[PDB]
Curated annotation (Swiss-Prot), chains A, B:
Species, as recorded: Severe acute respiratory syndrome coronavirus 2 (2019-nCoV)
Catalytic activity: TSAVLQ-|-SGFRK-NH2 and SGVTFQ-|-GKFKK the two peptides corresponding to the two self-cleavage sites of the SARS 3C-like proteinase are the two most reactive peptide substrates. The enzyme exhibits a strong preference for substrates containing Gln at P1 position and Leu at P2 position
Peptidase C30 domain boundaries: 1-305
Record note on what altering N142A does: Does not affect ability to cleave and inactivate human TRMT1
Regulation: Inhibited by pyridone-containing alpha-ketoamides compounds 13a and 13b. In turn, alpha-ketoamide 13b (tert-butyl (1-((S)-1-(((S)-4-(benzylamino)-3,4-dioxo-1-((S)-2-oxopyrrolidin-3-yl)butan-2-yl)amino)-3-cyclopropyl-1-oxopropan-2-yl)-2-oxo-1,2-dihydropyridin-3-yl)carbamate) inhibits SARS-CoV-2 replication in human lung cells. Inhibited ex vivo by michael acceptor inhibitor N3. Inhibited ex vivo by compound 11a and 11b.
Cytoplasmic side: 1-305
Cross-link (Glycyl lysine isopeptide (Lys-Gly) (interchain with G-Cter in ubiquitin)): K5, K90
From-to range in the entire protein, with total length: 3264 to 3568 of 7096
Subcellular location field: Host cytoplasm; Host Golgi apparatus; Host nucleus
Subunit structure: 3CL-PRO exists as monomer and homodimer. Only the homodimer shows catalytic activity. Interacts with host FBXO22; this interaction promotes the proteasomal degradation of nsp5.
Name this protein carries in UniProt: 3C-like proteinase nsp5
Function text: Cleaves the C-terminus of replicase polyprotein at 11 sites. Recognizes substrates containing the core sequence [ILMVF]-Q-|-[SGACN]. Cleaves and inactivates human TRMT1, preventing tRNA guanine(26)-dimethylation of tRNAs. May cleave human NLRP1 in lung epithelial cells, thereby activating the NLRP1 inflammasome pathway. May cleave human GSDMD, triggering alternative GSDME-mediated epithelial cell death upon activation of the NLRP1 inflammasome, which may enhance the release interleukins 1B, 6, 16 and 18. Also able to bind an ADP-ribose-1''-phosphate (ADRP).
Active-site residues annotated for this sequence: H41 (for 3cl-pro activity), C145 (nucleophile)
Annotated effect of mutating M49A: Does not affect ability to cleave and inactivate human TRMT1
Length: 305, 305
């Protein structure tokens, strides 16, 4: 039936995007109820970027220094505050398009959809994973700050990411909606080490199960392995160690296909050691780690919102 | 800055999805103004599927045999007609969420976003290409019929595809919004040959330009080629012949990067003949053909809607 990197429908989030301007800087904001959330770096200028004193810069700002526009609707700013690396602008009108929502701090390896925006307007939507080193490999240009990542559960939008910056390496960094960065990153123009990234093993296994469900079974072999033997191979190829928790999360896919999790690990061990010999799996010539076990079940079961 | 398979924001299309039921069959419909569009195969049963007589089956139906539900809003069917392979149900209420829209018949090689739906509810969004053989490699399950493909140009949605069926090969087939199938396909349960597919050469070249823009330049070599020499290699590797029209469409990317189109063709020639030697381009170990030159410019220039 096919398997695609599927994003959540973005409608509920499109209704929340606004443009925030402070002086010469314009970026995106998220309008939920009577609060607009945006990166605090909206208040810093070219001369400040290397190490802004956000407390001092914010003290020089008043409510009328923040211009918020939702499409053509001009919002009135009646309060401002900084929470970690986000600015929270209280507005005098609750967003009539506010969906049911939660703010969540996702774990590394989990996925979410990103609605990339510029000037408070949607440009596109794509699915991505929070890397183990807390970076995201997105697609973002200047002005994309304030774009958000989210997941949907029936009618509820769980916002998990707000884009802040590109690192000199071309990867992306941001915060949860309480303004806490994912990873060791700071909101200043400096070279910052992201550190060693690894492949999300439980996601690669989930994608191998998605492949079996779709008829791509060439990689199934006559071997089995142990959790400890597989983890020796995982450490060698910079893959995350597999735990019993990960095995338990793969239970539904193991049940649907009749392939024991450790048998799928022995197939993955052979692909790591021998490569793919010019073959493809679900249209890919690499081992894909951007689908969680939940993503595979949602896509293979047609879960709606 | 990264490069992702980016879909259009789906909000404008989510507001148009409805559920259409006729007897025991339920699928998706598209509600635009006072007309609901859906696959005509909504009127066929398990005993008819092999070769339905759609004219006879439709004659046995009346307006009250079609139930249309938009969320929880029950629409009143006041007219029905068949146009090619689509059914057009006239309803007594114009959709208040109707966007500015056009119906278009896309050319093979062009791309569009698909909003996959079940029971009139959105499940996900993804970008895909109309293959040269007029199939689509989507992600669709039973009940996905009536889901649509579209492109957006500022505030206008151009609908180009309505999903009808999966072929026994696992690829997907459908129609434009006037009910004409793309390709030689018919709406019946039979084995149908899609014929030889080829790789969309102009799209592979556009993606190589996107790679150069993002700093992946390892594949740039010291060779050049001619349009005729490159076409000898294209025929050998089942790639579409490149024409001057394709060279002209790549003009903006050639200008932005300073790499002449024929020089990029000589790089592509070397990748086809020598493979990628275990290297990747924009995170892929295969040559990607699902980005048009327009898609690359939109993504690299941050075009909003
Ligand atoms: C907003 C957006 C971006 C950005 N994201 C992706 C690609 C390019 C760019 C420029 N940003 N990158 C860095 C920053 C900085 C500005 C100075 C304060 C710290 C964050 C940024 N903002
Ligand atoms: C609707 C949806 C699908 C479908 N799409 C993707 C994956 C699985 C399935 C079943 N359909 N496939 C075939 C058809 C037929 C039904 C009988 C008439 C011709 C079309 C279909 N409808």
């Amino acid at each position: 039936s096919g398997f695609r990197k599927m994003a959540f429908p973005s409608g509920k989030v499109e209704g929340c995007m606004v443009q925030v301007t402070c002086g010469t800087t314009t970026l995106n904001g998220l309008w939920l109820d009577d609060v607009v959330y945006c990166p605090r770096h909206v208040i810093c200028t070219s001369e400040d970027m290397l190490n802004p004193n956000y407390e001092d810069l914010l003290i020089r700002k008043s409510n009328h220094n923040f211009l918020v526009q939702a499409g053509n609707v001009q919002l009135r700013v009646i309060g401002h505050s900084m929470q970690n690396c986000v600015l929270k602008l209280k507005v005098d009108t609750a967003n009539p398009k506010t969906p049911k929502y939660k703010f969540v701090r996702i774990q590394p390896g989990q996925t979410f959809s990103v609605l990339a925006c510029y000037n408070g307007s949607p440009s596109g939507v794509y699915q991505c994973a929070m890397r183990p080193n807390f970076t995201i490999k997105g697609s973002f240009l200047n002005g994309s700050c304030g774009s958000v990542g989210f997941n949907i559960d029936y009618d509820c939008v769980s916002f998990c990411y707000m884009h802040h910056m590109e690192l000199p390496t071309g990867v992306h960094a941001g915060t949860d909606l309480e303004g806490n960065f994912y990873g060791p990153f700071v909101d200043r123009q400096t070279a910052q080490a992201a550190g060693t990234d690894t492949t999300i093993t439980v996601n690669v296994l989930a994608w191998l199960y998605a492949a079996v469900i779709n008829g791509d079974r060439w990689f199934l072999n006559r071997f089995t392995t142990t959790l400890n033997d597989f983890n020796l191979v995982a450490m060698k190829y910079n893959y995350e160690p597999l735990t019993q928790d990960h095995v338990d999360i793969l239970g539904p896919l193991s049940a649907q296909t009749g392939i024991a999790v450790l048998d799928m690990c022995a197939s993955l061990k052979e692909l790591l050691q021998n490569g793919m010999n010019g073959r493809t799996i679900l249209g890919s010539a690499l081992l894909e780690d951007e689908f969680t076990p939940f993503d595979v079940v949602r896509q293979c079961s047609g879960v709606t919102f």
